[PDB]
mmCIF file of C-alpha atoms in Angstrom:
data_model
loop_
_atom_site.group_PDB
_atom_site.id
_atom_site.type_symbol
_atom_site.label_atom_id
_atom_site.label_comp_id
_atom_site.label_asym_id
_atom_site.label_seq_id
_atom_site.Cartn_x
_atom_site.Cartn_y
_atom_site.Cartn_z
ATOM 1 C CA UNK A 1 328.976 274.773 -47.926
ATOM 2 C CA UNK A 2 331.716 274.519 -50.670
ATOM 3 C CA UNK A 3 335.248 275.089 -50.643
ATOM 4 C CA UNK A 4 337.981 275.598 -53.070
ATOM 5 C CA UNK A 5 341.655 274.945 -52.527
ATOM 6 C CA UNK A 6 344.639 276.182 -54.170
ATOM 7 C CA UNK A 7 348.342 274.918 -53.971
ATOM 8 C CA UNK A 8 350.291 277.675 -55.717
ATOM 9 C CA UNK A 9 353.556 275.658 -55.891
ATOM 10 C CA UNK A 10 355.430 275.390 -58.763
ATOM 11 C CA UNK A 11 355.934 271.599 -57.626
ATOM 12 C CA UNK A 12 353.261 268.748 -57.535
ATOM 13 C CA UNK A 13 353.346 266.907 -54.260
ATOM 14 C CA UNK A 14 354.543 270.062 -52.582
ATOM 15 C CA UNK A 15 354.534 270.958 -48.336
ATOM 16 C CA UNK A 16 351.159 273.757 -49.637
ATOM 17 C CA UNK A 17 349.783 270.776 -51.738
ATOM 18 C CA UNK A 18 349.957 268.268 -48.361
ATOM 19 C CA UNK A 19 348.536 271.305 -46.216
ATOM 20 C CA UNK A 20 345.326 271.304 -48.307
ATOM 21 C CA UNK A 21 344.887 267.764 -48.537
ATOM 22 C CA UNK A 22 345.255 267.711 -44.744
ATOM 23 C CA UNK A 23 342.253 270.652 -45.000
ATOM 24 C CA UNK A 24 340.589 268.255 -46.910
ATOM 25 C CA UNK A 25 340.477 265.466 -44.997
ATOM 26 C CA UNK A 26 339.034 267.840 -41.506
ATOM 27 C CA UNK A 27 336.515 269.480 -43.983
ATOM 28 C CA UNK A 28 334.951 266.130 -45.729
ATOM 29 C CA UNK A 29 334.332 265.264 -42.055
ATOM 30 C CA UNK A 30 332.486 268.512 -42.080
ATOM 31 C CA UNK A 31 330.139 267.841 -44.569
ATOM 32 C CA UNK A 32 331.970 270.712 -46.807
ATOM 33 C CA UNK A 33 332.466 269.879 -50.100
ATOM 34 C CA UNK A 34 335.868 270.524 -51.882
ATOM 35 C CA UNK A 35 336.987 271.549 -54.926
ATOM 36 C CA UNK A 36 340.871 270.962 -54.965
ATOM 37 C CA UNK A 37 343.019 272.599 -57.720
ATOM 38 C CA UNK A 38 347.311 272.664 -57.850
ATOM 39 C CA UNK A 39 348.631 274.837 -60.840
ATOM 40 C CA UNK A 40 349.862 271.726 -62.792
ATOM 41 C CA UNK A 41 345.984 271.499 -63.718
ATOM 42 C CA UNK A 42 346.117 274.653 -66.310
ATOM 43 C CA UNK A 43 348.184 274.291 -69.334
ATOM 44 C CA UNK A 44 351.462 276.704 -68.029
ATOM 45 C CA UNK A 45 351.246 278.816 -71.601
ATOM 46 C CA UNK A 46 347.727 279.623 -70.735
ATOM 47 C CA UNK A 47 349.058 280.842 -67.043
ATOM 48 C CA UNK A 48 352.017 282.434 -67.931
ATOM 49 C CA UNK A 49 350.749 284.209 -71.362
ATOM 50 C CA UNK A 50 347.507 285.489 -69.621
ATOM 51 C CA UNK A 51 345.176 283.521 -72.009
ATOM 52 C CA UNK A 52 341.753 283.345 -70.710
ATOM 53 C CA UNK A 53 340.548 281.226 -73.029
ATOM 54 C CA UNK A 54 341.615 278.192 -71.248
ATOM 55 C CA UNK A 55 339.281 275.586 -70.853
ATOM 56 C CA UNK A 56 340.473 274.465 -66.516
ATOM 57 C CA UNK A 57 340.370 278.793 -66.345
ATOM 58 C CA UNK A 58 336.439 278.369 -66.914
ATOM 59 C CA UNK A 59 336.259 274.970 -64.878
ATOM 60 C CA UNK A 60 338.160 276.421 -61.666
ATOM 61 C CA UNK A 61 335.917 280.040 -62.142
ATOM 62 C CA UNK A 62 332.920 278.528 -62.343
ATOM 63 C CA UNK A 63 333.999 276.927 -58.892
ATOM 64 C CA UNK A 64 335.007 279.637 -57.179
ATOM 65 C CA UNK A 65 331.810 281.233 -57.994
ATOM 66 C CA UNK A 66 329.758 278.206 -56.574
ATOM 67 C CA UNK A 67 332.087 278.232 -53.244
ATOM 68 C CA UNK A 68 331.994 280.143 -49.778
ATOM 69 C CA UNK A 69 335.203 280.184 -49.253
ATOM 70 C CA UNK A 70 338.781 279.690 -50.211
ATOM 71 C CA UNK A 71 341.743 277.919 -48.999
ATOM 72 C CA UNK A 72 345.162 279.649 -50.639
ATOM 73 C CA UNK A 73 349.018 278.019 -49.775
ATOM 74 C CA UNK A 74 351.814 278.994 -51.396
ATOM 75 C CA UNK A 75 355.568 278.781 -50.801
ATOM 76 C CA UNK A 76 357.138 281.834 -49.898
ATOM 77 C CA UNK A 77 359.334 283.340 -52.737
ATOM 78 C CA UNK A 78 361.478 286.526 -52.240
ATOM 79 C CA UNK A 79 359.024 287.598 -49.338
ATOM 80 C CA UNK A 80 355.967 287.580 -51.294
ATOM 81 C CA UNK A 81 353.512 285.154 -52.720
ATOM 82 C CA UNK A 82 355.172 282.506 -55.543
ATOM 83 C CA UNK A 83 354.769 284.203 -58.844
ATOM 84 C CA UNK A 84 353.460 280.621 -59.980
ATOM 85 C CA UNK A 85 349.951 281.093 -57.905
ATOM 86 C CA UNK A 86 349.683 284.826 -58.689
ATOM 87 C CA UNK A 87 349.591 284.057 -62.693
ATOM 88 C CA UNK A 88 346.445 282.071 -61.617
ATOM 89 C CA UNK A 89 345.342 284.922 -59.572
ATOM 90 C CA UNK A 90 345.494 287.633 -62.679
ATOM 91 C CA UNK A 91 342.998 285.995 -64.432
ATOM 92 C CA UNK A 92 340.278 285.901 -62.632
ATOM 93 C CA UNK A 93 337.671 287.906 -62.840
ATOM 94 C CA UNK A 94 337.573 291.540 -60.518
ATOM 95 C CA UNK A 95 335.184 290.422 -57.851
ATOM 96 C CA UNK A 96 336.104 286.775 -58.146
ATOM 97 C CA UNK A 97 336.514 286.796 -54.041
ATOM 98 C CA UNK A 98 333.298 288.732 -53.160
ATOM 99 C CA UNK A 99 331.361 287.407 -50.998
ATOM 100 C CA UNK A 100 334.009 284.706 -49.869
ATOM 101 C CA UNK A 101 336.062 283.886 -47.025
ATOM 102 C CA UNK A 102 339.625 283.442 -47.710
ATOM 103 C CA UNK A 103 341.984 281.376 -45.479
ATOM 104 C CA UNK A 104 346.260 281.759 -46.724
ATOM 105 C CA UNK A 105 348.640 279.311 -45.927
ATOM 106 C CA UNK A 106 352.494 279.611 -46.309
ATOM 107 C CA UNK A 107 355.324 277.517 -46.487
ATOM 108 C CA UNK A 108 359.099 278.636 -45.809
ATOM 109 C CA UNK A 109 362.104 278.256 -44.090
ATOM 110 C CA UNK A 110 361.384 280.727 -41.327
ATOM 111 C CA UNK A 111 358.336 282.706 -39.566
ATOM 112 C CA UNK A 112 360.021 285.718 -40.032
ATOM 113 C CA UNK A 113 358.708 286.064 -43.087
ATOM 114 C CA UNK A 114 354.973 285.484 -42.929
ATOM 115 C CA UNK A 115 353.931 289.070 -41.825
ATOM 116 C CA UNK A 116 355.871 290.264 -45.045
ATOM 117 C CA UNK A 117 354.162 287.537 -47.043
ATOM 118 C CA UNK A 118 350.683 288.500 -45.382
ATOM 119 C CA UNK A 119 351.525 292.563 -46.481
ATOM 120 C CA UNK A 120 352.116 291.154 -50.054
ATOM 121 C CA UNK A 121 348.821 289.174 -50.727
ATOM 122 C CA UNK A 122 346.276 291.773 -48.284
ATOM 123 C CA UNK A 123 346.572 294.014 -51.534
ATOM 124 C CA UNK A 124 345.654 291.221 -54.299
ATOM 125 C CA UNK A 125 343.078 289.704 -51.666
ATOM 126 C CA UNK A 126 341.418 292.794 -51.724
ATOM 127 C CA UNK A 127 341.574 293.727 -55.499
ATOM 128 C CA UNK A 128 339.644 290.865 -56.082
ATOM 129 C CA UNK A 129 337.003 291.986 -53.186
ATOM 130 C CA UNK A 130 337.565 289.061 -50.757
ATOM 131 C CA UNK A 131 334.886 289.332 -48.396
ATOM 132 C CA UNK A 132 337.080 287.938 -45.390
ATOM 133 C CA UNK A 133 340.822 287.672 -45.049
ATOM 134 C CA UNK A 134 341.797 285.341 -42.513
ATOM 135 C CA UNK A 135 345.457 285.652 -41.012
ATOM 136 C CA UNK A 136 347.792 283.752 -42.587
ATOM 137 C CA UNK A 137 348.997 280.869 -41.294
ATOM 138 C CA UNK A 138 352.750 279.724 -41.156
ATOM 139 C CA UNK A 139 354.347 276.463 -41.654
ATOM 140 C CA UNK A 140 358.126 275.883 -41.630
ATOM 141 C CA UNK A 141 359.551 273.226 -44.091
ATOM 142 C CA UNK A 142 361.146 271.783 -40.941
ATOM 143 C CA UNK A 143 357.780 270.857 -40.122
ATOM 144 C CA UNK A 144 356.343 269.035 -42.439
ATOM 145 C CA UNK A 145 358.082 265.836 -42.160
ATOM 146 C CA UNK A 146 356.469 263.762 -45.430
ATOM 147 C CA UNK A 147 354.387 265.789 -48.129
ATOM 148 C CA UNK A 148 354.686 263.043 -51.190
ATOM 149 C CA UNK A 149 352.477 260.706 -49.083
ATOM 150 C CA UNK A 150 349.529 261.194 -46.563
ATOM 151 C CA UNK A 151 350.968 264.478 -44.890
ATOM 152 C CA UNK A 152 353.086 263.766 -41.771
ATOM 153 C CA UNK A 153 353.139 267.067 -39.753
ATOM 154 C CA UNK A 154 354.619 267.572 -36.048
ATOM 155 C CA UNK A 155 351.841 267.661 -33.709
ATOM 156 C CA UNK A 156 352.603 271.635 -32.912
ATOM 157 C CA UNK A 157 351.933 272.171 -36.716
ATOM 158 C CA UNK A 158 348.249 269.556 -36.830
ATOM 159 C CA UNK A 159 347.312 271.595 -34.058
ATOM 160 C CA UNK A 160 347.875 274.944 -35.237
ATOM 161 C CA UNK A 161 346.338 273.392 -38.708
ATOM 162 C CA UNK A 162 343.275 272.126 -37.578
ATOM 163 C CA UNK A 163 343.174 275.653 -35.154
ATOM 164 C CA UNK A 164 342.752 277.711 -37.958
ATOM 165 C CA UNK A 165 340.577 275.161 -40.288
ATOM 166 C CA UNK A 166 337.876 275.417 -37.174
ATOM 167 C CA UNK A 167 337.873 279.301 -37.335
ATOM 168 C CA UNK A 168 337.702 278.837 -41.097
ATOM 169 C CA UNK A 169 334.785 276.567 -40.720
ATOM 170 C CA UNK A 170 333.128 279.574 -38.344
ATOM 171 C CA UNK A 171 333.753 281.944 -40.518
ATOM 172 C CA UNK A 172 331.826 280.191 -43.497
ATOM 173 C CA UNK A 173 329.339 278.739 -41.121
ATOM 174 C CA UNK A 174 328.199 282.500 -39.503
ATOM 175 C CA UNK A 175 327.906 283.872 -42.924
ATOM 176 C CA UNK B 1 378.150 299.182 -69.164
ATOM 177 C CA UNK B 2 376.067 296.647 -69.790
ATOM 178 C CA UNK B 3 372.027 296.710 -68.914
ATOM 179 C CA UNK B 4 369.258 294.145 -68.588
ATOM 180 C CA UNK B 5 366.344 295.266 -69.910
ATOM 181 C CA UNK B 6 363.259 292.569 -68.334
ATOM 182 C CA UNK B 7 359.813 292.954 -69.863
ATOM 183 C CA UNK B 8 356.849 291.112 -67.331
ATOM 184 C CA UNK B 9 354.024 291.271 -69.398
ATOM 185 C CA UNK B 10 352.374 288.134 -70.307
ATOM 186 C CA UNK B 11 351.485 289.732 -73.518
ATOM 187 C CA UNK B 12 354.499 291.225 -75.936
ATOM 188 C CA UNK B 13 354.263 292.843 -77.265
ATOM 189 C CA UNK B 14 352.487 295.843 -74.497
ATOM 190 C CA UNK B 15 352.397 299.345 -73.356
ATOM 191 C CA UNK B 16 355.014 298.555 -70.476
ATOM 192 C CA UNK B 17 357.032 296.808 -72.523
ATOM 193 C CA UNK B 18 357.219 299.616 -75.320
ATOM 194 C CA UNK B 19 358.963 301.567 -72.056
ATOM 195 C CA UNK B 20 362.212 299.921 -72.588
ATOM 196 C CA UNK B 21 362.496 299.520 -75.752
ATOM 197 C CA UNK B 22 362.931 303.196 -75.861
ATOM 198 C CA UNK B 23 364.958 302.611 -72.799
ATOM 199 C CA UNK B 24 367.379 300.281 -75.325
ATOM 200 C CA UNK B 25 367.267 302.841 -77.900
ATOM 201 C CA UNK B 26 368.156 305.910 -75.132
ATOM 202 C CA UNK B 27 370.733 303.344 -73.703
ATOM 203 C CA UNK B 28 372.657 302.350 -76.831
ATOM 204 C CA UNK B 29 373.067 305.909 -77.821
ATOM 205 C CA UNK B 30 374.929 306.657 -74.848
ATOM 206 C CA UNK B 31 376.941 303.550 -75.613
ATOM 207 C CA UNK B 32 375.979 300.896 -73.099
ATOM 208 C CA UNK B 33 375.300 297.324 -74.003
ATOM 209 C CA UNK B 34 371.715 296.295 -73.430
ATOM 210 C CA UNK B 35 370.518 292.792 -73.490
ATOM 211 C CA UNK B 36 367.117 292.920 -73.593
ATOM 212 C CA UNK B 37 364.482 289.939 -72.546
ATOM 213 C CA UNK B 38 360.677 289.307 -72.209
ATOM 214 C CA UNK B 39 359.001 286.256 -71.017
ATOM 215 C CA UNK B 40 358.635 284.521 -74.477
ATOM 216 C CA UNK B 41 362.410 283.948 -74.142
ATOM 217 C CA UNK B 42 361.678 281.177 -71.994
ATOM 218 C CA UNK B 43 359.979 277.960 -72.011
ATOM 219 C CA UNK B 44 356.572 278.930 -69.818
ATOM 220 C CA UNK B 45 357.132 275.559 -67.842
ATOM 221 C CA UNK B 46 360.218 276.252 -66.932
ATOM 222 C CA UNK B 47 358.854 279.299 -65.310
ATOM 223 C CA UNK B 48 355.800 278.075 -63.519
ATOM 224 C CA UNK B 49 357.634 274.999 -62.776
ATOM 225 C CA UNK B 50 360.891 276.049 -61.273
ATOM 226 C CA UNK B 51 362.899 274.475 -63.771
ATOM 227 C CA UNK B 52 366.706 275.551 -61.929
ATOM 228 C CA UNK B 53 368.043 273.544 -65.316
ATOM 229 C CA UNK B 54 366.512 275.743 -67.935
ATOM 230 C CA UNK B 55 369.058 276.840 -70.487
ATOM 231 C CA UNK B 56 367.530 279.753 -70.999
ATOM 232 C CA UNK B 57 367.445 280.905 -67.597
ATOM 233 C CA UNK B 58 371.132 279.823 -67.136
ATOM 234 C CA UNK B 59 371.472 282.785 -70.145
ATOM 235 C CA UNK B 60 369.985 285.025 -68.725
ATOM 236 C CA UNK B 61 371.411 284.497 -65.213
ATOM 237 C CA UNK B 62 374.816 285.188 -66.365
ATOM 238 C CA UNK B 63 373.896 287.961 -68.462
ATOM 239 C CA UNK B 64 371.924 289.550 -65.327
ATOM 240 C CA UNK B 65 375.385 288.636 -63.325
ATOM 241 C CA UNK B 66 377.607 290.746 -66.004
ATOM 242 C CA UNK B 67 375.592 293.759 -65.980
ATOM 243 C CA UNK B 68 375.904 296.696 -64.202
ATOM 244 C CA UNK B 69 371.834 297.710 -64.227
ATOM 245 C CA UNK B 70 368.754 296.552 -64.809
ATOM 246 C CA UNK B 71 365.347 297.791 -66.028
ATOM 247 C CA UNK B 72 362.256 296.289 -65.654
ATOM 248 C CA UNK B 73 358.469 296.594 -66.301
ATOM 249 C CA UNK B 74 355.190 295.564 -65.300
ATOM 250 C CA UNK B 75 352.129 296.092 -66.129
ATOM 251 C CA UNK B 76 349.536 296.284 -62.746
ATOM 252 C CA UNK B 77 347.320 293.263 -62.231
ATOM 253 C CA UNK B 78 345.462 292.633 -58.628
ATOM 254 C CA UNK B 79 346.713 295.885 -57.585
ATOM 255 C CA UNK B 80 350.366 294.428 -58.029
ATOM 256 C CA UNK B 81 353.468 293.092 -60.401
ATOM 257 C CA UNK B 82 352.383 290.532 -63.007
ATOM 258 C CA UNK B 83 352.697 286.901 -61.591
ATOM 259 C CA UNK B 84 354.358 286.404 -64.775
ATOM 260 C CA UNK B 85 357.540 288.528 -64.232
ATOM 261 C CA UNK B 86 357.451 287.523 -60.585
ATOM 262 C CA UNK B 87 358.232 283.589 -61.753
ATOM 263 C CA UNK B 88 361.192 284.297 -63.822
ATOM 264 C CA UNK B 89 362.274 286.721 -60.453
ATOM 265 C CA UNK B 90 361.538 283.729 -58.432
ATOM 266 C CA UNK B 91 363.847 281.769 -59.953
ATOM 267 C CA UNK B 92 366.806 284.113 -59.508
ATOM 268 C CA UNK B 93 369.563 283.676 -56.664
ATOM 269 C CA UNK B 94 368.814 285.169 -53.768
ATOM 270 C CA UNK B 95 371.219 287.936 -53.935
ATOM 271 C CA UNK B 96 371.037 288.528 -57.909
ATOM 272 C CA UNK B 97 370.928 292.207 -57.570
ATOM 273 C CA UNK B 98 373.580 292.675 -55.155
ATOM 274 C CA UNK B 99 375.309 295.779 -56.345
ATOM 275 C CA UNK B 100 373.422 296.611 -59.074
ATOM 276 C CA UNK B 101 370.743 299.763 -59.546
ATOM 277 C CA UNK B 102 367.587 298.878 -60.867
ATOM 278 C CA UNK B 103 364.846 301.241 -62.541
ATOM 279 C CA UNK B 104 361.152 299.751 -62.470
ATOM 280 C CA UNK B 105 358.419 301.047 -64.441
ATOM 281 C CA UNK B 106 355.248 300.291 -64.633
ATOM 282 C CA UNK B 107 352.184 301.242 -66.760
ATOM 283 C CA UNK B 108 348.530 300.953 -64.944
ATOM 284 C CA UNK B 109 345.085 302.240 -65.121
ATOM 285 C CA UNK B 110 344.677 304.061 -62.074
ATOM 286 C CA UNK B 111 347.190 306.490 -59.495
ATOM 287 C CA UNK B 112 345.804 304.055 -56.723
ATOM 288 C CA UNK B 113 347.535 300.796 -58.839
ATOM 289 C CA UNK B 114 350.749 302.720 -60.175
ATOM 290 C CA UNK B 115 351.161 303.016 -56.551
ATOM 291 C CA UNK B 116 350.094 299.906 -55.167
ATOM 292 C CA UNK B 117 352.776 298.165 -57.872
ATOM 293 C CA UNK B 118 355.388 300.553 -56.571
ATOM 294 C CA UNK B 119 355.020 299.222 -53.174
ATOM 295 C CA UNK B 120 354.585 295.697 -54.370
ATOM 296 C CA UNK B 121 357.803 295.935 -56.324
ATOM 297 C CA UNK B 122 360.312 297.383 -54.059
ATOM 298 C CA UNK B 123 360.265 294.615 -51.365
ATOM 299 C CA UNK B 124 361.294 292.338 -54.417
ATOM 300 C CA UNK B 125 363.922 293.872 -55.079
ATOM 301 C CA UNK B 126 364.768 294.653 -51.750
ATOM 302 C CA UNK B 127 364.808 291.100 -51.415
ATOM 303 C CA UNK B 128 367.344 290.782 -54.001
ATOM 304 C CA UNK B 129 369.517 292.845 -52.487
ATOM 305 C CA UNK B 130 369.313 295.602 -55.125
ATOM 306 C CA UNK B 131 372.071 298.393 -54.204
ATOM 307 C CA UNK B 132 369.958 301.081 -55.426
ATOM 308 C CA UNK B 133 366.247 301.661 -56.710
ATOM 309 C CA UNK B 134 365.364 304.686 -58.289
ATOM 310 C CA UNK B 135 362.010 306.308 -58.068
ATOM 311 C CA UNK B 136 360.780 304.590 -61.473
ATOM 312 C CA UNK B 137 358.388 305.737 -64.226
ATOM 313 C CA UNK B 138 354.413 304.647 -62.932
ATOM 314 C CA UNK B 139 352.638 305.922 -66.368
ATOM 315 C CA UNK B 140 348.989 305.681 -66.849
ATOM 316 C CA UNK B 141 348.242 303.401 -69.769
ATOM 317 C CA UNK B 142 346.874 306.358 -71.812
ATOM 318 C CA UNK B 143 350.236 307.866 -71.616
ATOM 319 C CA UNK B 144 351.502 305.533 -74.517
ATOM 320 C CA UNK B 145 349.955 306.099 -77.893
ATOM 321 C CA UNK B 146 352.082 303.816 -79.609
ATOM 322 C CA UNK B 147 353.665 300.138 -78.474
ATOM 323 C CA UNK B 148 353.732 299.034 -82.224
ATOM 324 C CA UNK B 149 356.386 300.158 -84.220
ATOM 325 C CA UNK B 150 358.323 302.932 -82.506
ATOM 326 C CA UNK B 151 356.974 303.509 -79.319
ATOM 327 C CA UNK B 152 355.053 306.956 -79.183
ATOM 328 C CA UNK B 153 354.337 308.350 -75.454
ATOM 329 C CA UNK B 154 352.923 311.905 -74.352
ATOM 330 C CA UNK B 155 355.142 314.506 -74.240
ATOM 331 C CA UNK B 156 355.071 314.609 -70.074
ATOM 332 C CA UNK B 157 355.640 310.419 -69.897
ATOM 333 C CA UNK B 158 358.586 310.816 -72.829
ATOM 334 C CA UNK B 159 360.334 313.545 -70.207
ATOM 335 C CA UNK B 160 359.550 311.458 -67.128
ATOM 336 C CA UNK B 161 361.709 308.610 -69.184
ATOM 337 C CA UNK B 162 364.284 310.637 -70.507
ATOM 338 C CA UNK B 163 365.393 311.824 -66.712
ATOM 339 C CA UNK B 164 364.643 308.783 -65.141
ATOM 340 C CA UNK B 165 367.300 307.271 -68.068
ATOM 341 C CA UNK B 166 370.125 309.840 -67.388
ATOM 342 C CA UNK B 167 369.780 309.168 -63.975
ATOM 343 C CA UNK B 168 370.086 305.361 -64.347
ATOM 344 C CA UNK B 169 373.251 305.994 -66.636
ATOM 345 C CA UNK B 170 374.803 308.162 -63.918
ATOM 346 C CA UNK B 171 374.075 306.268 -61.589
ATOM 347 C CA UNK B 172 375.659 302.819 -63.123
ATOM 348 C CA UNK B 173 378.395 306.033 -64.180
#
């Protein structure tokens, strides 16, 4: 089993960045092997001038295409997605999420938003044919007490992480 | 009157954006002062990196504060806005549109994506506490001949943006 993850922050460490290396950390103890990517690994004109072309584009496609799944966290901007991951998302291929499982993580300031935040990626997830959508998974800044070091989370927050990694892990692991 | 005009494809120029530079042209006819950006205008960095300090930003976040409108477009990627206009949106305060109307257009392949952008869209701006947003022009791509030069559309997308106009200028007044 392989796994990508994404940190669609427009900031490098960032609270999505210390959520996936806390995914990480569960998964090598799976035996699950990881690719990690954050959006300061493409050159930003390639991202934000749609140039496919890039050489990391190729690198992180080939990837995704070699993994069973897909860990996504992003920051929630104006109650959607950050428009910082989604420039990554428009250039991938159309079916780049067939036959994958797709877990979303989001950061913000308030649960409120994550069912509005869930509503705005369901359509994208799909466009790109994601074989299995998991639902997304909130965690408030508040919460994440250290994200430049080894992540420091409350324990309500590990729990819920580590809840969601497992049915992530079943997911991948039926299929 | 003064009116943003905000292109959000990665690519300029493109068939969405050719929508308001008619839009500029229809605009400064009726006398209103358009200032009139794409995404080149800005260091891409800045954009994916949530630069707060970017001049150019700080430009056109006052300019956005002075009008009285705005019109954007978008072409339809993943069934949604380009990421690329949603950065320079993500970077905007969170009440930018607070008392202004806003027309969005949006060119697309299919009737199932100029809708999918519509609803994609409108939550955005929603979000930015837009005071009004008008139905919008959701052409399909074939509709523009011509996003060189003067823009050429068919004669149903040219009337679609015609009334769509008028009704943005009435409703700025």
């Amino acid at each position: 089993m392989r796994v990508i993850t994404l940190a669609g922050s427009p900031r490098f460490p960032s609270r999505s960045s210390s959520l996936l290396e806390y995914a990480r950390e569960k998964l090598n103890g799976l035996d699950v092997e990881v690719y990690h990517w954050n959006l300061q690994n493409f050159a930003p004109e390639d991202l934000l001038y749609a140039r496919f072309d890039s050489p990391a584009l190729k690198t992180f496609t080939e990837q995704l295409q070699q993994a069973d799944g897909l860990i996504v966290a992003t920051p929630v901007y104006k109650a959607a997605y950050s428009g910082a991951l989604k420039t990554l998302l428009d250039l991938l291929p159309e079916r780049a999420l067939q036959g994958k499982v797709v877990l979303p993580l989001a950061t913000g300031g308030t649960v409120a938003h994550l069912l509005a935040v869930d509503a705005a990626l369901k359509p994208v997830l799909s466009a790109l044919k994601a074989q299995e959508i998991l639902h997304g998974v909130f965690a408030d800044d508040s919460q994440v007490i250290d994200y430049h070091h080894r992540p420091q989370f409350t324990p309500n927050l590990q729990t819920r992480l580590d809840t969601a990694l497992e049915t992530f892990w079943q997911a991948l692991h039926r299929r």
